[PDB]
Copies of this chain bind each other. A is one copy, B any other.
């Protein structure tokens, strides 16, 4: 019937965790697609590609985390298909980064709704889990991407390819 370890875990919490798992997996797929878009010889921005590939591994980690939680709280995982990304040819580093920002805002909205739920089903554990392991990472992600979009713009992207080249070398070539 129910697992020996289930307790205060509501069914809406569970379904939302499966949906969120599928979502994070989706984000990883998107970031992968963008990554190898910038690996293409007619784009050739190694640091853009490394960057998005890192983001893709991070998303995969987020999903696996959520699955570990599902099993943890006594819930049951159910995997769904992983929707192909909306694009196969992202136009530029700037455009890829804007799509990034929109994606991260999506995932953040989903996580905020999930926290609303865990709070309404009076599930504190799930609440503070979402808080400490996802929310801040989502704010930091959205911030980083916003700064990148701002700089790419102030430089003259996507008009000037010199811009995206320099941004690739001087911003994505060191740090996180």
Residues of A within 8 A of B (CB): 3-5, 7-8, 25, 29, 32-33, 36-37, 39-44, 46, 53, 60, 64, 67-68, 70-74, 76-85, 88, 101, 105, 108-109, 112, 115-116, 119, 122, 124-125, 127-132, 135-136, 138-140, 142-143, 145-151, 153-156, 160-167, 169-171
Expressed in whole angstroms, the Cα–Cα distance for A147 and B46 within the complex equals 9
Q: Which chain B positions have C-beta within 8 A of A164? A: 154
Contact A3–B42 (Cβ < 8 Å): yes
One of B41, B77, B88, B109 near A3 (C-beta < 8 A): B41
- Could you say which residues of chain B place their CB within 8 Å of the CB of A161? 151, 153-156
Nearest CB of chain B from residue A115's CB, rounded to whole Å: 5
Ordered nearest first, which 8 A-B pairs have the shortest CB separation?
Answer: A154-B161, A44-B147, A82-B82, A128-B131, A5-B146, A41-B146, A44-B150, A125-B135
Is B40's CB under 8 angstroms from A71's CB?
Answer: yes
Q: Is the CB of B125 within 8 A of A124?
A: no
**B79 & A150 in contact (Cβ 8 Å cutoff):** no
In the bound assembly, the distance between CA atoms of A176 and B146 in angstroms comes to 28
A44 to B68, alpha carbons, bound, how many Å? 12
Enumerate 25 A-B pairs (CB-CB under 8 Å) in ascending A order.
Answer: A3-B40, A3-B42, A4-B101, A5-B41, A5-B142, A32-B79, A37-B77, A39-B67, A42-B150, A53-B64, A72-B143, A73-B139, A79-B88, A80-B84, A82-B82, A112-B122, A112-B125, A124-B131, A125-B136, A127-B131, A151-B161, A154-B164, A165-B166, A165-B167, A165-B170
